[PDB]
Amino acid sequence: VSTLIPPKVVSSKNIGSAPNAKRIANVVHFYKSLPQGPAPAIKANTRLARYKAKYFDGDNASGKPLWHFALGIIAFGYSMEYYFH
Amino acid sequence: LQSTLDNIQSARPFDELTVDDLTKIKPEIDAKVEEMVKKGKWDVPGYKDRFGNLNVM
Protein backbone atom coordinates (compact mmCIF):
# COMPACT_ATOMS: atom_id res chain seq x y z
CA VAL A 1 0.00 0.00 0.00
CA SER A 2 1.08 3.51 -0.88
CA THR A 3 3.25 5.56 1.50
CA LEU A 4 1.32 8.07 3.58
CA ILE A 5 1.69 11.84 3.26
CA PRO A 6 3.00 13.01 6.80
CA PRO A 7 6.61 13.89 5.72
CA LYS A 8 5.52 16.56 3.27
CA VAL A 9 3.00 18.39 5.48
CA VAL A 10 5.00 21.03 7.30
CA SER A 11 3.14 24.01 8.64
CA SER A 12 2.88 22.80 12.24
CA LYS A 13 6.67 22.78 12.54
CA ASN A 14 6.31 26.55 11.95
CA ILE A 15 4.91 26.91 15.47
CA GLY A 16 6.00 23.42 16.43
CA SER A 17 9.24 24.39 18.07
CA ALA A 18 9.87 27.10 20.62
CA PRO A 19 12.42 29.18 18.57
CA ASN A 20 9.62 30.07 16.12
CA ALA A 21 8.33 32.32 18.94
CA LYS A 22 11.81 33.77 19.44
CA ARG A 23 12.23 34.14 15.68
CA ILE A 24 9.13 36.27 15.26
CA ALA A 25 10.41 38.43 18.09
CA ASN A 26 13.94 39.01 16.72
CA VAL A 27 12.95 39.32 13.04
CA VAL A 28 11.20 42.46 14.27
CA HIS A 29 13.67 43.47 16.97
CA PHE A 30 16.74 42.86 14.90
CA TYR A 31 15.76 44.52 11.71
CA LYS A 32 14.48 47.56 13.62
CA SER A 33 17.78 47.86 15.46
CA LEU A 34 19.89 50.89 14.60
CA PRO A 35 23.68 50.51 14.05
CA GLN A 36 24.39 52.64 17.09
CA GLY A 37 21.79 54.27 19.34
CA PRO A 38 19.79 57.41 18.53
CA ALA A 39 21.81 59.51 21.02
CA PRO A 40 22.79 58.99 24.69
CA ALA A 41 22.25 62.52 26.12
CA ILE A 42 25.35 64.08 27.49
CA LYS A 43 25.15 67.62 26.05
CA ALA A 44 22.86 69.77 23.89
CA ASN A 45 24.35 73.21 24.70
CA THR A 46 21.43 74.70 26.61
CA ARG A 47 24.39 75.79 28.78
CA LEU A 48 23.42 73.34 31.51
CA ALA A 49 23.50 70.41 29.16
CA ARG A 50 27.17 71.41 29.23
CA TYR A 51 27.01 70.98 33.02
CA LYS A 52 25.79 67.44 32.31
CA ALA A 53 28.53 66.99 29.73
CA LYS A 54 31.30 67.88 32.11
CA TYR A 55 29.90 66.26 35.23
CA PHE A 56 26.95 63.92 34.72
CA ASP A 57 28.40 61.75 31.96
CA GLY A 58 27.75 58.03 31.79
CA ASP A 59 31.16 57.32 33.33
CA ASN A 60 31.49 60.37 35.62
CA ALA A 61 30.84 59.32 39.19
CA SER A 62 33.37 62.04 40.10
CA GLY A 63 32.11 64.09 43.03
CA LYS A 64 32.71 67.45 41.36
CA PRO A 65 29.06 68.46 40.50
CA LEU A 66 28.11 67.62 44.08
CA TRP A 67 30.90 69.87 45.40
CA HIS A 68 29.99 72.60 42.96
CA PHE A 69 26.27 72.27 43.66
CA ALA A 70 26.91 72.28 47.43
CA LEU A 71 29.08 75.37 47.15
CA GLY A 72 26.21 77.04 45.28
CA ILE A 73 23.90 76.69 48.26
CA ILE A 74 26.72 78.00 50.50
CA ALA A 75 26.94 81.07 48.24
CA PHE A 76 23.18 81.52 48.41
CA GLY A 77 22.46 81.63 52.13
CA TYR A 78 25.77 83.40 52.95
CA SER A 79 24.55 86.38 50.93
CA MET A 80 21.18 86.04 52.71
CA GLU A 81 23.03 86.37 56.03
CA TYR A 82 24.02 89.84 54.82
CA TYR A 83 20.43 90.39 53.64
CA PHE A 84 19.28 89.84 57.24
CA HIS A 85 22.30 91.22 59.08
CA LEU B 1 16.97 33.76 9.60
CA GLN B 2 20.22 34.44 7.74
CA SER B 3 19.15 38.07 7.22
CA THR B 4 18.07 38.33 10.87
CA LEU B 5 21.41 36.90 11.99
CA ASP B 6 23.10 39.55 9.87
CA ASN B 7 20.81 42.22 11.40
CA ILE B 8 21.87 41.29 14.95
CA GLN B 9 25.52 41.48 13.94
CA SER B 10 25.38 44.72 11.99
CA ALA B 11 22.90 46.65 14.09
CA ARG B 12 22.53 46.47 17.83
CA PRO B 13 22.71 49.44 20.21
CA PHE B 14 23.70 47.86 23.47
CA ASP B 15 26.41 50.12 24.81
CA GLU B 16 24.17 53.18 24.65
CA LEU B 17 20.70 51.72 24.10
CA THR B 18 17.90 54.12 24.94
CA VAL B 19 14.55 52.99 26.34
CA ASP B 20 13.11 55.40 23.79
CA ASP B 21 14.56 53.16 21.09
CA LEU B 22 12.92 50.12 22.71
CA THR B 23 9.62 51.96 23.11
CA LYS B 24 9.96 52.70 19.41
CA ILE B 25 10.78 49.09 18.54
CA LYS B 26 7.97 47.74 20.73
CA PRO B 27 5.06 49.74 22.18
CA GLU B 28 4.98 46.72 24.55
CA ILE B 29 7.39 48.73 26.74
CA ASP B 30 4.90 51.55 27.38
CA ALA B 31 2.01 49.09 27.48
CA LYS B 32 3.55 47.12 30.31
CA VAL B 33 4.71 50.22 32.21
CA GLU B 34 1.21 51.68 32.01
CA GLU B 35 -0.38 48.35 32.90
CA MET B 36 1.84 48.13 35.97
CA VAL B 37 0.93 51.64 37.12
CA LYS B 38 -2.73 50.81 36.52
CA LYS B 39 -2.31 47.52 38.37
CA GLY B 40 -0.63 49.31 41.26
CA LYS B 41 2.37 47.03 41.47
CA TRP B 42 5.64 48.87 41.34
CA ASP B 43 7.70 45.71 41.63
CA VAL B 44 7.89 44.16 38.20
CA PRO B 45 8.38 40.40 38.83
CA GLY B 46 11.37 38.68 37.26
CA TYR B 47 13.46 41.87 37.33
CA LYS B 48 15.35 40.81 40.43
CA ASP B 49 15.57 37.21 39.24
CA ARG B 50 18.02 38.03 36.47
CA PHE B 51 19.23 41.41 37.57
CA GLY B 52 20.24 42.21 41.13
CA ASN B 53 18.53 44.50 43.62
CA LEU B 54 19.80 45.91 46.84
CA ASN B 55 18.23 46.98 50.04
CA VAL B 56 19.23 47.99 53.55
CA MET B 57 16.53 45.80 55.09
Q: Do A36 and B4 touch (CB under 8 A)?
A: no
| SS3 per-residue string spanning B3-36 | HHHHHHHHCCCCCCCCHHHHHHHCCHHHHHHHHH
Q: Do A33 and B26 touch (CB under 8 A)?
A: no
For the stretch A37-43, contacts whose Cβ atoms lie closer than 8 Å and that sit 24 or more positions apart, written own/partner, are: A37/B13, A37/B16, A37/B17, A37/B18, A37/B21, A38/B13, A38/B18, A38/B20, A38/B21, A39/B18, A40/B16, A40/B18
Q: How far apart are CA A81 and CA A67, in angstroms?
A: 21
Q: Which chain B residue's Cα is nearest to A28?
A: B25
Minimum distance, in Å, between the CA of residue B29 and any CA atom of chain A: 13
Each domain of chain B, given as residue ranges in start order, spans: 5-57
Resolution attained, angstroms: 3.8
Among the partner-chain residues B1, B10, B20, the one whose CB lies closest to the CB of A38 is B20
